[PDB]
Amino acid sequence: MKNDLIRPNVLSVKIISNVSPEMAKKLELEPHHKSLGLITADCDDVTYTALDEATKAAEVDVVYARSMYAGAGNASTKLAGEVIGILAGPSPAEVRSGLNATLDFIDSGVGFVSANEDDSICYYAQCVSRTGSYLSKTAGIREGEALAYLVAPPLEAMYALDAALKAADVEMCEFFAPPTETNFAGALLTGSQSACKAACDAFAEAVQSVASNPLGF
Amino acid sequence: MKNDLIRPNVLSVKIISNVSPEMAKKLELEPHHKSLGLITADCDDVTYTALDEATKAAEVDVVYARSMYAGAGNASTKLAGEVIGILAGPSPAEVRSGLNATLDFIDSGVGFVSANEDDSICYYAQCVSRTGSYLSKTAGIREGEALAYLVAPPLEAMYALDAALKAADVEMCEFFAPPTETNFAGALLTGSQSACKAACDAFAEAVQSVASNPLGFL
Amino acid sequence: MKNDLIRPNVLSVKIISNVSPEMAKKLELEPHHKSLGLITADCDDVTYTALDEATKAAEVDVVYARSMYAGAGNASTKLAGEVIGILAGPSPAEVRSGLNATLDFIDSGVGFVSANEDDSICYYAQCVSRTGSYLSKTAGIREGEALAYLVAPPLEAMYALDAALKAADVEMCEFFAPPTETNFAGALLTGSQSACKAACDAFAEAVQSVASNPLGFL
Numbered sequence: 263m264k265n266d267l268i269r270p271n272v273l274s275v276k277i278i279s280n281v282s283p284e285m286a287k288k289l290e291l292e293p294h295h296k297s298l299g300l301i302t303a304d305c306d307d308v309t310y311t312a313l314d315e316a317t318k319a320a321e322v323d324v325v326y327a328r329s330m331y332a333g334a335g336n337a338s339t340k341l342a343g344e345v346i347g348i349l350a351g352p353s354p355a356e357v358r359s360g361l362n363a364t365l366d367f368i369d370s371g372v373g374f375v376s377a378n379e380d381d382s383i384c385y386y387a388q389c390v391s392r393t394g395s396y397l398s399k400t401a402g403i404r405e406g407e408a409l410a411y412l413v414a415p416p417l418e419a420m421y422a423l424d425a426a427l428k429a430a431d432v433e434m435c436e437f438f439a440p441p442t443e444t445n446f447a448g449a450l451l452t453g454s455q456s457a458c459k460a461a462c463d464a465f466a467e468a469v470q471s472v473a474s475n476p477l478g479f
Numbered sequence: 480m481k482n483d484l485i486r487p488n489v490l491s492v493k494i495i496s497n498v499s500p501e502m503a504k505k506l507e508l509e510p511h512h513k514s515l516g517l518i519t520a521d522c523d524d525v526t527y528t529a530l531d532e533a534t535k536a537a538e539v540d541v542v543y544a545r546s547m548y549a550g551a552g553n554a555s556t557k558l559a560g561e562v563i564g565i566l567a568g569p570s571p572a573e574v575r576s577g578l579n580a581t582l583d584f585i586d587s588g589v590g591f592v593s594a595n596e597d598d599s600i601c602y603y604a605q606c607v608s609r610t611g612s613y614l615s616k617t618a619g620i621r622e623g624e625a626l627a628y629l630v631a632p633p634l635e636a637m638y639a640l641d642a643a644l645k646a647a648d649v650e651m652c653e654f655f656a657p658p659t660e661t662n663f664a665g666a667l668l669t670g671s672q673s674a675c676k677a678a679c680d681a682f683a684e685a686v687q688s689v690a691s692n693p694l695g696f697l
Numbered sequence: 698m699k700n701d702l703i704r705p706n707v708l709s710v711k712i713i714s715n716v717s718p719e720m721a722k723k724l725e726l727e728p729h730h731k732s733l734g735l736i737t738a739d740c741d742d743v744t745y746t747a748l749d750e751a752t753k754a755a756e757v758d759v760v761y762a763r764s765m766y767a768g769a770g771n772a773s774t775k776l777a778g779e780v781i782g783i784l785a786g787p788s789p790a791e792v793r794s795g796l797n798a799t800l801d802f803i804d805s806g807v808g809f810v811s812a813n814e815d816d817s818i819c820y821y822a823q824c825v826s827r828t829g830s831y832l833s834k835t836a837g838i839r840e841g842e843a844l845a846y847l848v849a850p851p852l853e854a855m856y857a858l859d860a861a862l863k864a865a866d867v868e869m870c871e872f873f874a875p876p877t878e879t880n881f882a883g884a885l886l887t888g889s890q891s892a893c894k895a896a897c898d899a900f901a902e903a904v905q906s907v908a909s910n911p912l913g914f915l
């Protein structure tokens with residue numbers, strides 16, 4: 263139903279000890295990050311927020327993060343989902359903590375929200391109180407700064423982004439131009455915490471107004 | 480069935496009045512673009528032709544037009560379809576006029592055509608008699624000249640484009656190298672309106688022949 | 698079943714005896730290239746290896762080869778599959794022989810292998826003893842040099858690729874960063890023939906290790 267959470271699921275996890283030099287060269291790892299933590303899930307933007315959360319609780323960096331074409335509902339293999347993330351750390355112990363932190367956040371109640379009765383429209387309006395090292399880098403903001411993580415299908419996102427930018431004292435940091443690999447869109451907006459929360463509410467309200475009137479104009 | 484029109488559908492339409500300055504920045508709008516018209520549909524190339532049609536009778540420009548990965552049949556949400564287009568204009572009233580023309584054109588009988596009984600192969604063979612400001616820009620021609628808008632699945636398109644180029648006095652203006660986001664392909668060919676129509680007929684004929692014998696010499 | 702070959706299927710094949718000058722340019726054919734051979738299939742990496750084999754058995758070059766977004770399981774039309782390849786040759790006889798070699802290789806037993814009982818995870822671990830003109834150029838090595846052609850889903854590929862690089866005296870030539878158009882990943886590794894084979898076996902074993910315990914320490 264409307265306002266129901268779409269629960270994200272982690273599909274696969276694996277840890278690498280002593281990465282090969284060739285692979286470290288490709289992934290441009292820091293010299294003393296000898297261990298990697300791999301993870302896939304069925305929801306990309308939640309996983310991106312979870313990976314950033316992991317950099318806050320463990321001595322890890324996000325070195326790879328990409329979404330799959332057409333989303334998790336169209337995956338052709340068991341573990342592909344719609345996202346792959348790679349954490350790098352000095353040893354499997356740090357990587358293990360990061361992966362555990364990632365999984366806990368994915369299971370913490372955060373996620374996309376359904377906008378109508380048949381769950382055919384959904385959106386992501388997440389206020390990140392304190393960014394880690396990954397979303398702050400992606401957004402070009404100081405680590406620890408707040409951001410609103412806003413994602414929705416193409417038209418809803420463009421309409422709702424305009425509403426969010428006008429409703430709150432926020433600035434655009436990164437634009438997810440439609441289509442992402444999953445055929446969504448959105449942005450990362452920064453500002454004070456209260457402003458990011460106001461933007462999340464305006465974004466969510468705007469997406470709902472499209473779902474209750476998709477063609478009326 | 481063969482020769483059936485695949486009816487295109489508009490999924491969502493919205494007008495943004497007084498677009499925020501940072502949105503105008505990311506979208507690279509011009510200082511006189513004050514209102515936006517958003518549209519999604521379940522058929523991308525038909526919508527691109529309609530948006531271009533809108534630029535002839537109204538003061539709107541096509542500022543954004545992108546297709547969705549794997550097409551409308553693989554959309555995960557109700558309104559994503561397989562295309563998003565954005566018109567920019569001086570006021571919401573002018574944008575409304577442009578969108579009205581876009582909707583009328585999408586409902587005018589244009590669309591993809593089926594090449595076989597189960598509609599598992601389809602193609603687009605549209606003669607654009609008089610281009611607007613969008614397709615003319617994309618093709619590198621002057622506004623008001625004609626185009627043949629030819630789209631089909633990868634192999635059919637490469638074969639049928641070759642048939643069209645031999646059959647009519649046209650030149651290649653824009654090549655949609657396989658795959659597009661929707662896993663189709665094609666091109667924009669220009670010439671006289673009769674040459675463009677001859678190219679459309681030859682393109683449609685070639686796609687149908689491939690559908691009747693996909694494994695060629697086997 | 699685990700270790701079962703995934704049978705690849707060719708979906709369409711077509712020859713063009715004499716390509717028009719316009720298609721010849723946009724497809725970047727050599728002046729002596731007069732004919733084209735088109736092919737689509739439901740498995741891209743097997744088809745790429747087959748096209749490369751064709752450049753060894755016939756006087757043909759691979760001039761176009763691309764994968765479809767989201768793979769063959771998500772194709773919207775009958776013949777799109779997940780790959781289109783184009784061979785070019787001096788006459789229809791060379792193109793025909795090239796296509797025959799391509800088809801013979803696709804049906805030769807090479808292919809993706811299932812990693813678990815329900816065939817929900819599969820991988821490609823193919824040792825190319827002597828590359829033709831296509832995969833050699835793709836990897837940046839001389840034709841005739843050997844390659845390990847390793848493909849698997851994103852997480853499996855990264856783990857198994859790292860495993861392969863440790864197990865053999867090979868170097869990374871081309872990295873298929875996840876996701877490819879088909880939402881797979883892998884790389885082309887070069888070295889001695891036995892070294893490339895050692896990497897292939899190590900890659901396959903590592904993928905199977907993830908498939909039998911996807912959640913790892915969890």
Ligand code: NA
Nearest residue numbers: 336553770771
């Ligand atoms: Na699908």
